[PDB]
Paper text:
Bacterial hybrid malic enzymes (MaeB grouping, multidomain) catalyse the transformation of malate to pyruvate, and are a major contributor to cellular reducing power and carbon flux. Distinct from other malic enzyme subtypes, the hybrid enzymes are regulated by acetyl-CoA, a molecular indicator of the metabolic state of the cell. The larger ME isoforms (hybrid enzymes) are predicted to be a fusion of two unrelated enzymes; a catalytic N-terminal ME subunit and a C-terminal phosphotransacetylase (PTA) domain. The PTA domain is homologous to PTA enzymes (that interconvert acetyl-CoA and phosphate to CoA and acetyl phosphate), yet they appear to lack critical catalytic residues and thus acts as a sensor instead.
The role of hexamerization was further validated by an E544R obligate dimer variant, which was insensitive to inhibition by acetyl-CoA.
Author numbering:
A (entry chain G), D (entry chain E), F (entry chain C): 440 to 776
B (entry chain A), E (entry chain B): 441 to 776
C (entry chain D): 441 to 778
Amino acid sequence: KVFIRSAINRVHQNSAANGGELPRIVFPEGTSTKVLKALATLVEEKICQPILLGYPERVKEKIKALDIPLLNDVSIVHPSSHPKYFSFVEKLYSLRQRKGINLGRAERLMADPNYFAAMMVNQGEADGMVSGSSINYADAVRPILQTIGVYKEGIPAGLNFVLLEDKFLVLADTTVNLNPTAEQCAQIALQAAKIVEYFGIEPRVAMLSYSNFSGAEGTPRKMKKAAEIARSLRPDLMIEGDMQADTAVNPEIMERLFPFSGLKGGANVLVFPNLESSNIAYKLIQQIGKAEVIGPFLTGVRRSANVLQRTTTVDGIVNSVVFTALEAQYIKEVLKS
Amino acid sequence: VFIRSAINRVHQNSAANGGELPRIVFPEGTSTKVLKALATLVEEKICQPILLGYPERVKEKIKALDIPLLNDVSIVHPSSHPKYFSFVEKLYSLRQRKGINLGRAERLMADPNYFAAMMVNQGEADGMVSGSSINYADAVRPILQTIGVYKEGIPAGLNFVLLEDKFLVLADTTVNLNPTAEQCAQIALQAAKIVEYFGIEPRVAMLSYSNFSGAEGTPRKMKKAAEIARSLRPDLMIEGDMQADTAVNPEIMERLFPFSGLKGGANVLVFPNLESSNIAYKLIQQIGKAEVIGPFLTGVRRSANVLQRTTTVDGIVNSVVFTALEAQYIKEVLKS
Amino acid sequence: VFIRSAINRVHQNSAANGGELPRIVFPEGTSTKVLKALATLVEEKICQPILLGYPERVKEKIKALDIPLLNDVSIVHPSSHPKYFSFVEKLYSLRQRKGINLGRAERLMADPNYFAAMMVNQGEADGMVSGSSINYADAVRPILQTIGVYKEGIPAGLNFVLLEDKFLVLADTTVNLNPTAEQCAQIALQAAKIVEYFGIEPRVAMLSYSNFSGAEGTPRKMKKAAEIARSLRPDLMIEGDMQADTAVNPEIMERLFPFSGLKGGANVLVFPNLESSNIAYKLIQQIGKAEVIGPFLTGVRRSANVLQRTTTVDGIVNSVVFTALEAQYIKEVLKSRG
Amino acid sequence: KVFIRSAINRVHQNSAANGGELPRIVFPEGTSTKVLKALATLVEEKICQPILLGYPERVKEKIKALDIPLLNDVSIVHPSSHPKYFSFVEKLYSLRQRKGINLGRAERLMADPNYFAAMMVNQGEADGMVSGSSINYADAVRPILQTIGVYKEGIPAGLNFVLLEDKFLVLADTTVNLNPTAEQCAQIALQAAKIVEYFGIEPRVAMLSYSNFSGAEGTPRKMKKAAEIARSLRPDLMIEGDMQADTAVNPEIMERLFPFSGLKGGANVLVFPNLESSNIAYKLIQQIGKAEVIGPFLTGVRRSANVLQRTTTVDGIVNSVVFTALEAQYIKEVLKS
Amino acid sequence: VFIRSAINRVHQNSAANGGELPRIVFPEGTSTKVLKALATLVEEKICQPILLGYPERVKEKIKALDIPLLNDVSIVHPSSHPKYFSFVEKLYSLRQRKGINLGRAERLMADPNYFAAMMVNQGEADGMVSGSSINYADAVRPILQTIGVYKEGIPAGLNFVLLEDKFLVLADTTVNLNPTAEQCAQIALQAAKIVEYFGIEPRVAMLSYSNFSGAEGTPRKMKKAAEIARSLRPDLMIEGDMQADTAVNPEIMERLFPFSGLKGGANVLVFPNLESSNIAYKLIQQIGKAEVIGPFLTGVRRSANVLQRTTTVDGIVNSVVFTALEAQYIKEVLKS
Amino acid sequence: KVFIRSAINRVHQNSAANGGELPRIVFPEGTSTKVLKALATLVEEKICQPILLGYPERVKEKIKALDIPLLNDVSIVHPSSHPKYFSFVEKLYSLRQRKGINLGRAERLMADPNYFAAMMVNQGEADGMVSGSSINYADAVRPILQTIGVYKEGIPAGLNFVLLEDKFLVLADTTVNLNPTAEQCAQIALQAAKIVEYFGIEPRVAMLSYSNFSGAEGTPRKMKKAAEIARSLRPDLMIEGDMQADTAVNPEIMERLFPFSGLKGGANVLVFPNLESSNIAYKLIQQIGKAEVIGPFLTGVRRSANVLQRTTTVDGIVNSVVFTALEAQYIKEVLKS
Ligand SMILES: [Cl-]
Ligand SMILES: [Cl-]
Ligand SMILES: [Cl-]
Ligand SMILES: [Cl-]
Ligand SMILES: [Cl-]
Ligand SMILES: [Cl-]
């Protein structure tokens, strides 16, 4: 409620500090009913320049079918017909020619809106992309990781916000790594923490397990080791584990049962031991928890690109576009430095 | 409401059994949270509690907390009890080829947890509730060593998520780190019969991070778990592998996977590993603004349940209510 | 000569079946090498080709290359074909529990490789030839997902080495990275039935770097494969483990391993792993002075063969000839079973 | 045909530049009929000074049976009776005493001509040895590896020549390593390349696989890594992989399908991913191909020693001794420096 | 004879320190075999024995078996000891991130084995002797959890075989199931310093079923173990892999493997796994006709030894004697 | 002391009940000093008809060097010169031709006394063999296992006797299996029990471990299940485990500490969990204990053949030949049945 309006306003503060320019967000699924309805609400709010990918004739005919006159302008680009199509094909080929992709396969991949979108963002023809409403997560994210890639020492990891009364929680990694090592969960925590700091909040990080400070072999030792590695890398942050999820979020359970712990006031960063636990958790909270859940957002990647969960609603997509715009604005300012 | 109806079936059971209440032994006779919860439960006439401990330490804790309604409850000191010596032999004979000599059987039986487990095993009590003061592994081991699992059963923790129109069942939330496909099928079968006890049709989802991919690893494992379970209960809707929102939301299922055999949303959610079950039910309980009760230990021959170390007083109240139902149900099975 | 005898058998099979020719669909409707090969094969009355692609882009490629003999040939664009929607639904139903949603079933079936395989699966074509423009895995995946293997079969590539008096059969040259002893025996059984189709007695060698050692690893594997194969076909000469020259040269066998059950040199060579099979047929084809034809995909329920990406035009001519033979045979099996 | 005369002429050039001395080549199989028949032609051509091992009494008696009058003067040595025999036992014993070989067992191994030949070569009593016409390769090569050993950072690897009309191809490793690592395949390539360079030919190296530049896990990744490691060690050489075999040899297939590749004009060095592929390939080419195949020759060992494949012909032994004399002359010119 | 010189060393040591006797805590205050042994050890002025238990229950056992020299030996009940709660806080602090909450530290500290080990850890005693009544793992676990291993040390049991003209040292007879080459080297180094304490030159054999084969498995492990050990003590004869008769018999070594660096026979025998060490010292003790003393726990921060469950009264006497030696030695090291 | 004299007298019983014939025992090490010295003592005792293998002159020459006139008549056989040599080659070749052994290698193996002795025993040309005084155990036992082989469901296992004053113990497997399964350990127990029964003693079997009735994973579980399997196969015997070695031998410790145990009166058959423990134990008892240890004897094989430990003394060999002669006579009576 409040959190999403506040992000929208920060987009505007960012934009009025850069000559009124809006980030350009490319959408591979120019024909998606859910994407188009979401774009209707966000064009009224001046959050981004949408670019739709597809056949101009298909896309315009879907726009009027759904009766949304506010999209009669939005840029529409057909990948094969774009002037840069050949340049993009050659650059994908050069990236993948020793990873089993011949030239003709590079052409057919670059004709796919998902690859064309990722290459547009990589080449500065757009500032970000939002994809994945119509296809599964692996299919949508592979072009991004193949084309944009991860920044140095970074790790691709999905991140979700749980919006509670007077507080948000950050959950990660909800989408990418099946079974991260201790070193990977430490890095996932570091990425999640800098996101929390961007919002003016102190990150307090819990490495989750089924155990409370046992350190037994398997995930308890892994999450205990992840906390130690992370604490070494950010000695200023509260980072703790291994601990159970209720121990983590509830400060009264922590202090009563584990008062030696370095984590006071409840964790707002929840790093998971495997993909089963992160993925089932955010989805169950979203369905039954009666709290808004936004994301997942792809962290660790060089440019702003987020893959929607296939189960997303229209309002989900709205929320994801807003934060993709913020991400796009922030990355463009680091690159100016 | 779901809890009030449970309290009522408990009363219905005893009125059909001469008014007797199940005897539930509590190893943690001095536990502040257990004692406060029992104040509420003797008021509701749910069970006959039996506290384990040194009687003067138990009575002085009751006196400290000012719970006059507990002044009559039975207190048993393990080492002093008449059955102690025979209990020591029963444990020794059970574990003598599992690294337990007679002297260590004696000191194990003096521990309230083992004495409670044996009281229940020998029919001296109808059920037990433990684990408010110790970690779950320490509490559940005497139970599994002493009472054991019924044939083809698997010990698995189960939780209820109480929503407005409906409850969800989550398992296995406590015992198996990484159940196989065969074990996940058996966990589902155990949870399904519990849902049936309350007059609800069980609809089972084998959870994963994937929607019907069947790729190697947990997607393949949970897909076969659904198949094995479908084999064993051809009358039930059992499906997987699927993501959790796919599982619970019938409109998401119908839109994206209409070939699925699962209609109307799942009310039985079987997990692929212990991290996911345990973290999920705990996050739901803390932030999900739904009541979560349990975990309850399924698959074991007599009624025994281990509280989560993080439980509240009312948590313990809720767990005792359903332990009483469990003890009553098992008690008539064995009369057969 | 071996190829001429195959062409005549196609005509022999074709006669006694109302003069009908098998219908062979080609996913790569604009491929220069495919169209050049079809010019030669239309003159020989080997098959009725079906080209997949946008009809105008196919006709423009045909007119550019100046191949007047193809102006009549059937051209089908997958998205536009009447059965496209029906084909999408059968692929969706086949793969909906293997990570494929409906929108993806639609985009797969619009790919000529998937559409051709489904055409063959549904009897709208009698066989298919693909893979001149894509790597082998990309070509064979739709075939295996759609058509599948017959019971107890294993998908395995097979190549013919045509020598002066003699042909050898090599397998598995394309599919299995590292087949088990059980899989290598089945590969032998599949290759043997192919050799028998041509009226030749199959004599099977299970290849290794070792001569009758049975030591752990592949020597033990290939010795056990021969045993499993001998059990399943007690009438065949099948032997291993042995080196390749021991296998082919009957004089080396007799001098050095006279106890062996393999006399007169092997004409079926089953390989222990994919590196050895794939490298061998390719080196023989480039540096030997013998024709190598194939690979042909064995073990699948309907006729589909994947050209090696490195093929020539004459290679494609040869593969279509034997694909036509395969399609005619499988079509007789399917009528027998109705 | 041509290639062998040129090698024979290079032996004579080497021998004319060093006072007419010929390398001394020990043959453990002193009564092998094939070895003796080949030796008839090898002394008429001044290729080597042969040393036959055996009971002098039947070696002369095998020679008189076959009626090869040109060999009655050639040296014949009986291992047990040799003056150096007992000193040889002590060096083998000291080498193997912590590898399960007692003194009496060193005595029996050293009485085996294969071990005696190897010790002769190692200690400078001969310049090279040729063995293995009558025993399998592992049995024949074991004494060589235990006694002579590999030079520093070397790997024992068998190598074969395929003699084509304008050029030869070299295949390796055709005999020793079951499943070489990426690092081992790089070293095998370097050894093969210096052999090609000895003949004044530019080596062009293909790391073979069933894949064309895929780098997928398993051997495609291994052969891609071997090419990378080898290029690091020889930045001046064309070395490429992973690739299929026809891709490797045929320069037109390479240029058409993989024009980014650093390997132009066809590979003349073919390094295999495992012993099944190398061993089966050279033998199938030799039997059904119509090109002569010579070898295998043992590379990577400190001193000149080659194992004949048990399947060898009489001409094979001749070819194989010639190249052993060349290697022996080469090492002998290295050591004079 | 060897034991008499050890006893005389015990007196020699404390006489150089104002006559203290080391205080040795016995967790098994009612153990019959412990109590009879203490009768002999009180007469010999070896230590100050401290028995753990209910004092009247201990005194009642003492005069029942009519043991008369223990009427003035010290008796401590753990729960009643003044420092009990301070001991509780210290165990909690040591293990709070290894799965032990405050309440579980409390019941553990009431167990004599944990209380005894903590007494030694905090300097209220100089050593402890346990394990007569319980299996070795149960007794040694509190010791290792509480006292722990010194830097680069490895917990390893060691036994003496007393022959007519020499003793052999066997290790590791109790702790490590299957030590690595690195661990076997550290076991050899630890055994070497014990042999050096008695003024004999240690000569170490890394035992195997193989004679200098170096084949994969334990032959290679024991060959590499010798190499690592020789690296760390270049002055010592350390050799392997070799068979047991090859190791002890110098004429077999010289005749069959004269290249070996080990001459005059090995007096330190390091074993490749726990089956071989444990079966060997036990078989030698029963059927050989040589005295076997131990096992003694090496590698730990202060003096703690676990009796083998099969021990005799005389076994306990011998082990208490050397525990006194160990305690005196460690007590002078820490003074520095 | 007494036990060995009782074996000698039973040898005389067996021979008198069979026309005074002595078993024929082949000794591959015809020049072994310790073997020859042992045989002087054994020929006066009417234990066997020895057959020495080697060059006749080499043996006659060693016999006179050591001056034992009692051997001047003993049979000497030179394998390659023996009439049966060619048929024996043909038979070993037929046994091993699919295990990497060509015809010429069969010839050189059959010329080795160890293989020739094994084939003599196998073909009934001799009744037993004793080898291994001069070579390591694996080397001596390989020809026996390849040629004579194991009887049905048998397992080759070394067995030793520890002769205590009221009693003997049997230890196994002291030589062959590195790490037997539970099933192998049960079969080893069954083999050792029938040997104890041959001497009129009730076998009482302990499956040894470092644990007392824990059944924990690893060795405790293996030996507990080994006991269970063996009890199933011989329901008439006391067989128990897992237990420690002193628990096993001492009936008072067992009765005091594990009174539930099925093993009363102490174990006289000690089955070991791995080769480290068996081999180290019998060697330590033999050296530092004060009791006689005889063997090891090879159990589980179809015909009588035993390998001396390389460390044996002259008495050792005498003791081993005595029990080999008993074994040969027993097997010879079974074979006539
Ligand atoms: Cl997905
Ligand atoms: Cl817990
Ligand atoms: Cl390919
Ligand atoms: Cl070979
Ligand atoms: Cl123990
Ligand atoms: Cl040995």
